[PDB]
Each structure stands twice: as C-alpha cells, then as structure tokens.
Amino acid sequence: MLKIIIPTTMLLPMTWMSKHNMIWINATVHSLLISLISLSLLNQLGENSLNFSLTFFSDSLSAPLLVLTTWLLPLMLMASQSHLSKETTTRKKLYITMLILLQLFLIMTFTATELILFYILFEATLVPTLIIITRWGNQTERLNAGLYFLFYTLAGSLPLLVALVYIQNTTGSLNFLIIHYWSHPLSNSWSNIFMWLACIMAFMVKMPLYGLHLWLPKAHVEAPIAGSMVLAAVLLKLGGYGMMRITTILNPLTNYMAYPFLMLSMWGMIMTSSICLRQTDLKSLIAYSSVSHMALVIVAIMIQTPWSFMGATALMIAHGLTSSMLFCLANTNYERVHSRTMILARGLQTLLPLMATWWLMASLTNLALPPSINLIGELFIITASFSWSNITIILMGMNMMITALYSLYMLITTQRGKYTHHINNIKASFTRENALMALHILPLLLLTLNPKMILGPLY
Amino acid sequence: MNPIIYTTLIMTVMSGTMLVMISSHWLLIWIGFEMNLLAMIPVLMKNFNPRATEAATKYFLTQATASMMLMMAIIINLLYSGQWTITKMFNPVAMTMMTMALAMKLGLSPFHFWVPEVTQGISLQAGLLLLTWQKLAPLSVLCQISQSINPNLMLTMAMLSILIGGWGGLNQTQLRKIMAYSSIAHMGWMTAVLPYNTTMTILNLLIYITMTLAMFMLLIHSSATTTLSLSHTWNKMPVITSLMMVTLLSMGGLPPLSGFMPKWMIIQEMTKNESIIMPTLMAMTALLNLYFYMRLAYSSSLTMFPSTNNMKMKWQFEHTKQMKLLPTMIVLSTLVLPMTPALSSLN
Amino acid sequence: LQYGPLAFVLGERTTRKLTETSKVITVDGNICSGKGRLAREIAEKLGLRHFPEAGIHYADSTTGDGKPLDVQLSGNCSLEKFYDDPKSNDGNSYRLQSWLYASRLLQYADALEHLLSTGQGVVLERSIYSDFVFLEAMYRQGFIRKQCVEHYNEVKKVTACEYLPPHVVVYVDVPVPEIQSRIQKKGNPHEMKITAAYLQDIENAYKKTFLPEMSEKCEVLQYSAREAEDAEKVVEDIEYLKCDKGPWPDQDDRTFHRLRMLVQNKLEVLNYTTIPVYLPEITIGAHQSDRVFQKFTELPGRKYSPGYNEDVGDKWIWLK
Amino acid sequence: IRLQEDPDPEDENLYEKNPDSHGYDKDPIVDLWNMRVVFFFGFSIVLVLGSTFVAYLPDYRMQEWARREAERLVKYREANGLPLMESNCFDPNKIQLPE
Amino acid sequence: KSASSLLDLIWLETILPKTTSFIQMKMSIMVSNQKGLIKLYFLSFLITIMISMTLFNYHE
C-alpha cells in the first residue's frame, strides 16, 4: 500500500524545496495527484480485506476514510490561501508540512494492521494539530484551546495503552486479523468491565460524548480555518474507525453496559442540537451540530447492529464532509468581517448570491435529505435503533426536530434576509471560495448515486 | 577553576563514577562515590557566587549523609554475611538501609527536596553535569542489587517521585527548577521498572540522558534561565526555540517522538508482571509533566513575545561558541521510535 | 581558535603580551569639548592605536562593511530627534542611551581584546564608565522618567562589573560657557537646541561621579583644555604615570582568561543588555520584531553565518 | 505608547490591484495560473475521470457473483424439490453435539 | 440557561476540567513551594527513615 504512503512522505521535500511563488501551486497540484492515487483503494473484495503487507492493510471500512483524508489535503491548502498569504515563505513551507504530516499520520493510522501500530499513529496526530491550533490560531483563548484538546484526548488514550499491552500479554497478538479470528467473549468480571472501560473511553472522549465534549467548542471555534475543518472532518473519526475494530472482542459486555453511553448520546444529541440552535457564534453551531451527528454514530456502534454499522460509515463521511463546507463557508464570512457573529452579517445573497447557493445546498445536506448518503446512513441508524428498541425513535425523532430548526436558521440570518447598510467590506466572491465549494459539495451528490462503496464493510 | 585543573576536576568525577560500574567490591563501590562527591563540589562553585556556595553545601550534607548510610548497609551486610561482592544483601534491614541511602543519592523519595534546590544556584553547565552524570553511579548499584530489593519499597518511592516530581513542576518559572522537577519525575520512571527488568531502566536512562543532554545544550545556546528571557529567544534565534518545542514534546512522552518509548516499554514490561494499576497511575501523573512542558513551549515558540530594540544589536554577531554534539542529540532524542528493537542490544 | 581552553593549556599568557605601553586609554570631556583630537594626539605620539567614539552604528562598523545599516534596522533611534525634541511620547532619549551604551560596551569589549591579544594599547573616546554622565544629566533635565534610569544603571553594574577598568583615563577640562558659545558657532541646527543646564550637568556628573569615583579606580590627571592643545603636555604626563592604584596589577593569568572568555564571544558581552524589563522605550512588540528581523534577514550578507552567504559572494559553499 | 506596536494592517483586497483576481496570490499571472491548476485536475480528472473509475469498479464485492449463483443454486433444489436453503448449514453429520 | 449557562458552559466544564486542574493547581504549592531552610529538609528525612523502617517496616 506504499503506493500512497511514500508520495506523501516525499511531499515534505517537495514543499520545502519548492520555489517562493509556487509552493501552494506546487502543494495542490500534487496533492490532487495523490488523491486519485488513493482513489485506487476503492478496490475491495467481498469480506477479505486488502492485506498489502505484514503491517499495512485496508478494508471496506478504512478505504472511504483514506480517500476522504487524501482528497481533503488539497482543500485546506486552497482554504488557507487567503488566511496565510501575508506570512513569510519559510513558515509557509512549515505550515504545509504540518498539513502533509497530519494527513501522513492519518493514512497510516487508518491502515495499520497491528492495534498498537494504530495506537502509536492514532494519537500521533495531536502533535501536528496542537501546532496548528495553537501557533496559527487567531483569537486569544487559542492558548487554552490546545491544552483542552490534547489533555482530553490523552486522558483516555493512556488507559487504552495499558489495556492494549495487557491483551498482547494475554492473547499473544493485537493484530486485527488474529484478534478477529481468535476473538473470545469478554466476561462480566469487574476486571473485565474495567478492561472494557479502558478500551472504549479512549475513543469516547474524542467521539465526543455528552459531557466529554468541551474541547470541540473551545478548539474548532478558535482553530485556524484549515485546522478547524480537518479536526471535524476526519480527526473526529479515528475513534470511530478504531471503535468498530476493537468491538470484536468486547462482546458480550457491550450489550450489557453500553446503556450509560447510549443514554448520554441520546439525551446529548437532543441537548447538543438544542443548544446549537441557541449560540451567538456561527462557528460554534457547526461544532455543536457536529457532535450531534457524531453522538448518533456512537449509538450505531453500541447496538453493533449490521444496519447500525451501515450508517456509521456513511454518516461519518457525510458529516465529515458536512462540517467541511460549513466551516469553509463560516470562514468566508469571517475574514470579510473579522468576526464570527451571525447577527453581524445577515442576508448575504443580496451581496453574494452564489455563496448563498452553496450555503443552502450544504445546509440541506446537513438536513439529511434523500437520496443524499447523509440520510440513508443516518436512516439506517434509526432502523437499527428501532430493532434495539422501538421507543428509541422519539428521542432521536426529537433530533429530526432541532437540526433543521437550526440548520436553516443561520441561512435566514446569514445568507437570507436583508443587509446592514454599514458593511462596505463585503465584496465579490473570489473564485477560490466557490471553487473549493465545488470540490466540497459536488462529491457528496456524486457518490450519493452509488452508496455501496461508502456504505461500509457490511455489504 | 583553572582550565587545566578544571579538566582533572571533571576527570576524577568520571573515573570516580566509573569506579562504581567496574568494581566488584563493596568498599570500592563506596570509594567511587566520594571521589565523585568530593570533586563534584568545586565545579558547582566554578562560577563562585553566594548562590553557588549555597547550592554546593546543601548537596554536600545531603550527599555525605547518603554515603554515610551507604557505609553501614555494607557493614551490616558484611556483619551478617561476611562478603564484599556486589550481590544480594543477606539481611533485610541492610537492604532497606541501602535503598534508603541510594535514593538520597538519587532524589527519589521526599529526599527529592535537594534536587531542585541545588540546581538553581549551580550554573546551567553544572546542572548539565548534575542531572545527567550524577545519576549513572547510583543506578549501576541498584541494577546490580536488583535481585533482593523489596518490590513494595522501590515501587512506593518510584511512585512518589513521579508524583511530587510532576506536581512540583506546576509552580515554577525558572527553567532550572522546572528542569529539575522534570528530572525528578523521570527519576521515578526508570526506578519503577527496576525490580521487574533492569534492561528497561537502562533504556529509559539512555533516553533520559540524551534528551536532558540536548535539553541543556539548547538552554546554554539560548543563554536563558527565566521563561521571560527564554521568551525573548524567538526573536534572535527562532531555530533554537523551534527545536525547543519538539524536544519539549519528547518530554511529555507524546508519540511518535522518542520520549514515548521509555514510558511505552516500561508499561509493557510491568503489565507482563501483572501490575496494571501502578503503570496506569504513573501514566496519568505523567500528564502533569507534559502540562508545564506545554506552558514552557507556549512561552517559547507557539506565541511570539515582546522583545527589545537593543537585541537587534545581537543580529550582527553570532554564537562563537559551539559545543559539538547538539545536532546529534536533537535527532537521537526525537526520531528513534522506529528503532525500538535495538533495546535488545542493552540486554 | 581564539584564546580558550586549548590556548591557556598551550601557554598563552596575556601577561607576557602585556607591557608598559599596553594601556587602555580614553579621553573624556563635555559635549564638543574636543576630547577627540586630544585622543588623536595621545594615540600616535605614544605609539597607540585608537578606537573612535562609539556611535549608533558602531556595531555596523564592526561587522560587515562598516556602513550604517538603516536606522530602523540598527538602533531605531536618532540623536537628531533627541537634540531637537527630547521630551516626547516615543522617549527617544533612552532609546539613544541604551543603544549607545550597548555600542560602548562593544566599543570597550574589543578594546580589551586588543590589549589582551596583541598588547598594543587602545585610545578610546569616553567609555562604559562615561555614559552614566549623560543619562544622569538628561534625567535631571526633565528628559525621561525614573524607571528608565533604574533599569539602565542596573544593567550597567550587571555588565561593567565583569570587565576591567582602563589603565589611564585622560580628561580635557573645558568651561561650560565656552562649550555653549562653541555650539552657537557650529551651525548644525540640532546642536543649537540644547539646554545650558544640560551642558553644566554633564560637567557636574563628570566632576561629581566620573572623576571622583574613577580617580581611586585607575587614574585621574585632569588636564585643562588650555593644557590640552599642547599635546606634549598631555602625552608627557602619561609615561610618567606609575598607575599603581587599580585592579590591573592584581590581574593574574587566571583573571585574564576569565576576562577574555567573556569579551571574546560577542553574544555574552552584551547578553545582559536585553534584560527582560518592560520600559515603553525599550520593548518592541511581536509584529515589528518579526518584520524588522525579516528585513534584517534580507539585509545584504546578514542572513547566514558570515562567510556563508552567496549574496555577498562567498564561494565554495558546498565544501565550506 | 507603552508597547510600541504597528497599526493593524488593512486587508489587501486582491480585486483592487487586478480586477481579475482569484483569491490566490498578488501576481495576476500566477493568479490566473492557480485557477488553471485547480480547474485542472481538481474538477477535471478527480471528479469526472474519478467518477468513471469509481462507477466502473470491476465487480465491487462480487454482488453479481452471488446474484448469478443465487439464480444458479435455487433452481437445483427447486428442480429436485428441496426447500432451497436449510435451517442449518453445518449439517448434523459432521458436528459433535455435546453428549 | 439549562443548555449553555447551566450545564455546558459551567457544569460539565466544572466537574472534570476545572476541578481536576484546580486540584493540580491547589496542592502544587503545598508540595512545590518550600521554606528553604536546611534544618527542616533533613528533619523531613528523619521520619522517612522510621516509616520505612518501622511503620510499614519494609524490612518485614
């Protein structure tokens, strides 16, 4: 699988040795090239995963993530074109290195064949993002933003490490294939429930879980524009991809003690969606809506119904995209006005009509309107939950109450309505914003026509 | 200290230390310590400021007392066994009597008090010698006697060292005090695995040594001892403070950096010995270490800090000083994780 | 290599190089008192090489080509502004003093290097133990606030105490009213704009702190300006100066090594001029300090280590 | 003055310098370029040439193999009357039921 | 109120992050800041010997 790994490793000499003017022209022109190279990984067998080597392998679950990450990397490049034009060239090369290194650690992480190799490359991603969030951030609190990020993720990461080595000494291998074939029932002993607690709370923290979610509002809001998309789009989803992987040996204790988490997600998803409708900062909305959708997929894995694993993958990519346009859009209002208050800028179609067109179709994508894979994945979660419990619908049905209650709400107060006559700052839309808008939303309608590949391994 | 004699000032410290590894007789192991001790004092006062004489003396009473206890632990063992060879002690109290002394040599237990205190007065160069070299000699003795150390003794004193060592770091602003508490916590990390396997304590000792080497290299190069003075260094030399960050990440042990492997391998070995609660506890407590690493990094390179105008005078000149080997230690102590199997060479 | 570990071990004793004519000398006087030409007279008559008065761009003279690199890129101060309007928000007075005293630190550091390495003496104009005259004078003139003074003299004792006082210090005594009349006939508009009390104040600090607290230090041989024109009178007093009092005689090769270690590497002689104090006239925020260095980076030559920049013309870099 | 600081710089509107700007860089020739890069592969061969690749996977997950096989198997047991697939697959002959 | 001001901005942010970070902050100075007089330091060494030798009695 070094088809994709090495050219990204080499991309660091590429950007570092590139000339003064190109750099970003260089950075994109080859990151797109790597994207179609990673588009090859769409070749799955039925159920036997693509085992490329002893340490690297991929399956129907990992591959959609790989294409998401690799194709994402050009997007923050062009997204960061505006924000970081003033800075000198050397840090420009360093910033791209952080982006490439981040995507580098992502692709190996999703493709590791040994659990600890996944873990070492799991939390290896906070190191570059901590640099991105803290150094290149904009507002003052960004200092405390990074601390909240790493400490939250680490507070659960270390228990996983102690658990992982324990399984190594107990079973003899943490490799996905061996642990899957030699999967054994995790008994109900108090020792084993804490083992389950160790192997789950790590992903739950950066899931996030209701109550264990403060980092995203304190990080995504003050993260740099490029950094903000990457966190929500994919760096949310390491825990998820790990979660469906480690859940092969935690049975049957999962069906017995997932209730507190199924609780905290269900109430949290309504709670997060409701508070999402009542923030004064637009950037907090995509952050709070993100966890609301993200709280949904934790429900999927807990019931571990085949249908639940169906929508877990689809919603992951769907939301992972969905947060991307909104953060891109929410960015576009910011630097134009140097504020993230939706109240300050209202009715932008009277000034930016094309931006509004992109705004609404991303919004209705967040609405989970079929045939978009946002709904079908999200819908499969509903069906699995009903199989788990018929009553489940009402609490989550309350989530199909708040989403559109806010997901069109900023539309009618950011892109829709009248304009304040004092902001002459608002200007025409540079084609970059619409162009990246095109590569952002056009895919989601494209693979909508063909949902089986991003459906997941349960096909 | 006269340059020519300053060399032999350090020569007997090294050979006095080297006597500890190579000897097989308890008195010789005892002799190697004061030769280290008696010659370690003057270099601590090479600058010879009232703080330096302050720093040296607290070392002396602490170290001389520890060697004094070291002496009887030999004698009671001799009285109850009649052998001087470096093997297990044959009398339990003599064992605990030694382990108590070597800790004060090492700054593990509440004895850790003397470590941050002396580091302030003694210069950065002297500190470079203290937290790095002055730990090799006690570790060698502990590795040899590892057969018959009380496991609940070593573990308890190791656990506290990472506890206070990490916790005391979250108060300081002088880099030397912060550095000493970081060393104190790392003192606990090696010593926790000491009874189970002694290969890991060497491995963590090595990683600790090169990282603390490279760490002080940067501090001398930045020529700063206070966070504000270090905060200035973003202007004159951004490369120094840029790498200041990366090795500070290896401090916390955050992968894929080198600093993870000591914590990683120790947790693995300890879990093989069915101790899971203890490694988990130090794993959490290590976050306190990482916290004042992050704040130290924050005031270093993530955020620019107010500089001065007379510092643009400095732009004209450069470091005429070098000391070789800083480029090697940054690399060796940051990118070595893909070479974990090389730890078997120590075995 | 410079005088260091190996050199002392090899046998480099500066006492062997130090001789009678090995003297660090400087001439002090009022503003445009003419201590300069008298410094010229004691230079070539007593076979002695001379360092000019330290200026704003004296460091730019030491490194590179000698040209005064842009003031914004070197010292961000001008004595024109200080002489024209010294009482402003920018506080150009202390920015001038801090930079100039730092230049005097360098201008004295290499003077010690000349004596220590070669043994051939140095003639200076003023010295490190002369800038407290101006700062004390101008503070008394309502020119700055008190906090600047307490930080200047603090860094002054931090640095100057390390070095060694000069062998002999000459003085050109001139009446203050003559100096005021002297400036009236110069013509440069900036030096018209002076306060007569300031002209008496430098004389006061010269006759209250400099000459009294430096007589017992090394040597005061206060020479009148009227005795100063007769260059023979000043220079004849010099070799017939026993110069017993002072820390020079009790300067063994041990203290010589410690002095040369400090003054050889230029980053430690002025290491303590960037004391992290927060005076308004001394602290530049992040944005300028970023940009200005980025300017100094593309400033010719001064980007890499000297002799390693292709823009200058340095060759054979691949095997350098 | 306290902290000597530059005034906050004003946003550089790319369109005012060249009113054919693209939000890519100051220089127009590189600016029109950066479009021809993204408006190259980005939309051209990642989406369009990408779509034909992903939409023309050779038997992704062999669902057609099961299809024609499912056609193939059901007629066999329907030809001889067997009720196609059976409640159990690991047939009772080779398993070892406890006691 | 119940969403941001009560629970999210305060309560969940009070229990785990603020309180635990306070605990680190609260007892740091009890263990980090010390008087510095030499007498008490070795006085502290005293009781450490007995508790090691007598209280838990690592010898037994």
Partner: peptide, 26 residues
C-alpha cells in the same frame, strides 16, 4: 492579525512563582 501575547500576558508567567499566593507573595 492573530492575537499575540502583550506585556500583561508576560507578567502572568513573570513572578517569582508563576502562580502565587500569600506565602509566596513576599
């Protein structure tokens, strides 16, 4: 421009103890 630490921000980590109380005040 992004926020950068000012003079006041430095003073926070600028005391004899960067987080003080009454005992460490003097």
């Amino acid at each position: 421009r992004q926020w950068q630490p000012d003079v006041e921000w430095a003073e926070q980590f600028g005391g004899a103890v960067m987080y003080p109380t009454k005992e460490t005040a003097h």
